[PDB]
Design a protein around this ligand. Structure first.
Ligand SMILES: [Cl-]
Lengths: 612, 642
């Protein structure tokens, strides 16, 4: 507690806070214990890299030398990344809402030595006023904190780690959910009509699953309009490729220029399924452009994919991705007129006087660029790469890598793109290299691994291993899927058969939550339901089938008690209640039956092959 | 209690002693009661028909009139057939384990009237006449010394044979450690468990193969193959008439014990069927159809079922029936004998006691199928061997062993399209099952002499046999028969704690109801029950069965980790029970090629259920939830379902 130990950590978001004068500590047993022997409170700060206001609180307070000594003598201050320890975030995010104050990131908390919180807040501006007031309260009111900490804690243990009575899996529960999700779709712009606009991968899954199981063409058109209009807006990089996080306005125009790995992997699957229904060439182009961007800018020397790249370059939001007309005319030359007519370039611009490239003005026309404006588009990228390039988060998250490995495996299978498979295998063997002592790591960077993993890490690697089987047909990927299943059971399955996000042997966690709340990615148990359901179709394990039906009813029992974020559970249980299985006997990959199965991607079906 | 009542017993080993001057008594309540009324210790003699040193003690002592008079004077004499009453065998073999003796058969022990033992020895030749008087002194001098150590032995028996600790969770990691240490004991060059003698060790081989299937462990697979291939190429195998002998004296599988057991060949046929399906080595295929020919020709009784064993002593000499000399081979085969002598390593000096034991260890890697001139000499030498004095046969029809043979024939007949093997398996199944009246099957019978009640191994073996015949025929009646066999086991062996006991709960001649947790040459009773109840769950999909099986597994694992040896079968069964595979086949006609693929892909972890709704034809099978439909051969009909 007298030296900043945030150096060498696998999270790049914490590495930037290493030079801070406050002795930052990582979340671990050595941090909580020191708070006991010194009877000093804990000050927890949660944040993620692509958050403009996590850096604001840094330069305003934490990077200031004076206010850090106030923290160094009053608490044991710890910094956590929302994406390195998502278990810690979800615990103390729901802890804030239970105190009667909603908030987001950064999140500043106050913890007694055992970890239970008693006061929190989003961003703290008097900051130092409280920074001492809690220290006063820590000494003046030990009786008040113990009364207040265990009251919020009992609300957490009942909201995040309390099993419910089993609930019967019924079809009408999903059809009801699909009707209400459909009523939130903006009929003209696409997506949830509220602003800001998020891609909302779980919300899309319900509409597509509604279209497949019910042939409800209304939700199918809601899925297609929302996906297609988004991929045409400024939220997508029409020059290099890759989708951004979310949109500021409802027209999908002005975005947050950070590019997350999970959002790109989750739309490749959506666009892949969407191509098989409409044949619209735009879905294929967006997939092909984003995959090239993933290999070029996200893939690490070892093959694994980085987490994300920054939205800020050289100190301004999106300086790297936006153009003015006077510069694109200087580089292109005579071919500059047709380029500006393609991406709605205007002298006045569409964002703060600048021009963000988009294809919303001609979204229904042909998506393929003419040969002159394609060479003009490629020429700008070579000139754009000379700019001050935004920083990258080289942290290799196992759960996020599994999402991408599954995306490249399924899209490469349907489009017969053999190059996409090889890069999926490289990321597979790179992530799978950390599997030692019957366990895998959560994240990794610069040779530093974070153990133990989370339940999402095994579920994602189970789904990626099974996807690699469908594309290849090598049964060694099914054996890998069972190896990940055994590791998941040995560390996350409780006595009731339920799975919990944090490992049961992890000692630095207050609460072993199930992980039932979705975000941009479906929840942990949501992914686990799907992964185990697909693993049954690939093996025929009857004991797995019997334990899955229990797991389904347990999760549905808690999902009924949830107020939000249960969409992934109802989606996975709808698929688990009626899965599709297809065995194909063939003599080679060129067989007709194998081909029409490849050209028919279905998230509800798992393919199996036998030599004949 | 004054005569030899051993005649009429369902055993050939006991009838060999019916004419002994000893007033032998079959094990039962009458012998225990007669021992109490006369204040006399019981002279228990346990053996089996194939044992060589069981016959030498009978020829030295049990047929001697001088020592038969003193056995009838101050002892009540009870002889037990090991294969007829294996529950009694496990009770009093553990008694020697509590006394410090190594153990073995013949087993000669001394029991006080209540049945608890106080002094036990393996083989006591004559002295035998002295040790009888020595024990006879203790019963009239100091009985308290007997009553002290007799209770001390019993407490150790109930603490190891029928002690139930708290249940334990089913873990896969503890199965991998067992497979790792077993493979470390395998002979890297000669195969099998390194050390003499070398036994087939069926439970050990089950672990190595399960480790290969569940872990893709190529090392354990090659250990299973090299051990099986070398054994089937050694002198322990009958290269003329087929069949496997029960163990080998040396480490090269050369010199064997020439007796042939039913459980040995039933167990290796299933192993060889699995080995052929992966390697494609014709040696495994040839050895199977050679031994099945031997089972039908030499072991099958006229009433359908299979005999228990085939003796090793012919005309009083060990293996005289199977062993050849060179000059006789030259006389029978003529000028084409050198082609045969080189194929089976026939030498003028002989490989065992101046004579030749036919084998293939000289070239076990060459082509297994012999050339046509050699097989012609092979068929003719076997027929000439049939003119020899033939070794005797134990016509006793053990239920559990017949169940093992039915399963082997049903699985091999299914993977080789041999319908004649299935009908022979149905003959034994219907014949043995004829004693299943009043919800009670018999443990064994011979010449109209039945033995009741059955043991837990009998129902477990019949369940596995019934479900094996279902996979080969697809008849639902075999499933209900499998249900009938379990519920009879429930009503006669399942205790209040949900566990099963080897002896029936109504049995009166057992001093201790053991669980049957200890393996022998066959997996233990508890193992077969876990396997049968798992395969019954696969064939029926009954959720109530799955729930009571998981808690039966956890209670068996609690006892399995306390015991120090003989738990391999339970660990093998629980690994399969933790990951059992089922295959649903939706066929429009039973000539559907998925039925073919399943037949040529035998897996000891999979059970196939059929639901009716020749060359290789590219097809597709589609299932929507619990709704499976017949296959599809065209490209358009597949687009309709997708
Ligand atoms: Cl045995």
């Amino acid at each position: 507690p007298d030296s900043n130990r945030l150096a060498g950590e696998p999270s790049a978001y914490l590495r930037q806070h290493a030079n801070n004068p406050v002795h930052w500590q990582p979340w671990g047993r050595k941090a909580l214990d020191a708070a006991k022997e010194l009877d000093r409170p804990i000050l927890l700060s949660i944040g993620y890299a692509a958050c403009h206001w996590c850096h604001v609180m840094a330069h305003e307070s934490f990077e200031d030398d004076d206010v850090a000594a106030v923290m160094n003598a009053f608490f044991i201050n710890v910094k956590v990344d929302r994406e390195e320890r998502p278990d810690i975030d979800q615990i103390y995010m729901a802890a804030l809402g239970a105190m009667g104050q909603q908030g987001g990131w950064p999140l500043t908390m106050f913890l007694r030595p055992d970890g239970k919180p008693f006061w929190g807040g989003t961003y703290i501006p008097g900051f130092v006023d409280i920074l001492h007031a809690v220290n006063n309260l820590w000494h003046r009111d030990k009786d008040k904190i113990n009364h207040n900490a265990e009251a919020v804690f009992d609300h957490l243990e009942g909201r995040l780690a309390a099993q419910s009575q089993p609930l019967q899996n019924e079809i009408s529960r999903f059809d009801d959910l699909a009707n209400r999700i459909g009523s939130l779709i903006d009929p003209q712009r696409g997506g949830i009509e509220g602003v800001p606009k998020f891609p909302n991968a779980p919300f899309m899954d319900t509409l597509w699953l509604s279209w497949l199981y019910r042939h409800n063409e209304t939700h199918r058109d809601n899925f297609l309009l929302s996906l297609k209009t988004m991929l045409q807006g400024g939220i997508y990089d029409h020059l290099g490729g890759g989708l951004c996080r979310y949109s500021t306005d409802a027209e999908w125009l002005v975005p947050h220029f950070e590019k997350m790995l999970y959002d790109n992997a989750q739309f490749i699957r959506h666009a892949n399924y969407a191509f098989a229904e409409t044949g619209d060439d735009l879905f294929r182009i967006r997939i092909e452009e984003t995959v090239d961007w993933l290999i070029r800018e996200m893939q690490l020397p070892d093959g694994c994919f980085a987490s994300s790249l920054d939205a800020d370059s050289e100190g301004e939001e999106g300086k790297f991705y936006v153009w003015t007309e006077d510069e694109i005319d200087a580089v292109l030359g005579t071919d500059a007129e047709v380029f500006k007519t393609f991406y709605a370039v205007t002298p006045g611009g569409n964002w703060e006087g600048k021009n963000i490239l988009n294809r919303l003005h001609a979204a229904a026309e042909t998506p393929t660029p003419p040969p002159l404006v394609e060479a003009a588009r490629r020429k700008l990228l070579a000139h754009r790469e000379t700019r001050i390039r935004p920083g990258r988060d080289d942290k290799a998250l196992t759960d996020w890598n599994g999402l991408a490995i599954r995306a490249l495996a399924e899209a490469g299978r349907s489009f017969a793109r053999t190059d996409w498979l090889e890069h999926a295998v490289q990321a597979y063997q790179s992530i799978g290299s950390s599997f030692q002592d019957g366990r895998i790591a959560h994240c990794r960077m610069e040779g530093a691994f974070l153990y133990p993993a989370l339940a999402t890490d095994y579920a994602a690697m189970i789904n990626a291993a099974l996807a690699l089987y469908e594309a290849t047909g090598e049964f060694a990927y099914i054996d890998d899927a069972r190896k990940f299943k055994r590791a998941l059971d040995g560390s996350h399955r409780d006595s009731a058969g339920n799975y919990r996000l944090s490992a049961l042997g992890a000692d630095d966690v207050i609460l072993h939550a199930y992980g039932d709340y979705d975000e941009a990615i479906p929840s942990a148990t949501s992914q686990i339901i799907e992964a185990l359901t697909r693993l049954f179709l690939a093996t025929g394990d009857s004991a797995l089938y019997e334990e899955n039906e229990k797991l389904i009813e347990q999760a549905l029992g808690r999902a009924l008690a949830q107020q939000y974020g249960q969409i992934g559970i109802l989606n996975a249980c709808r698929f688990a209640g009626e899965p599709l299985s297809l065995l194909i006997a063939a003599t080679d990959r060129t067989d007709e039956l194998v081909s029409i199965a490849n050209r028919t991607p279905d998230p509800r079906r798992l393919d199996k092959f036998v030599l004949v």
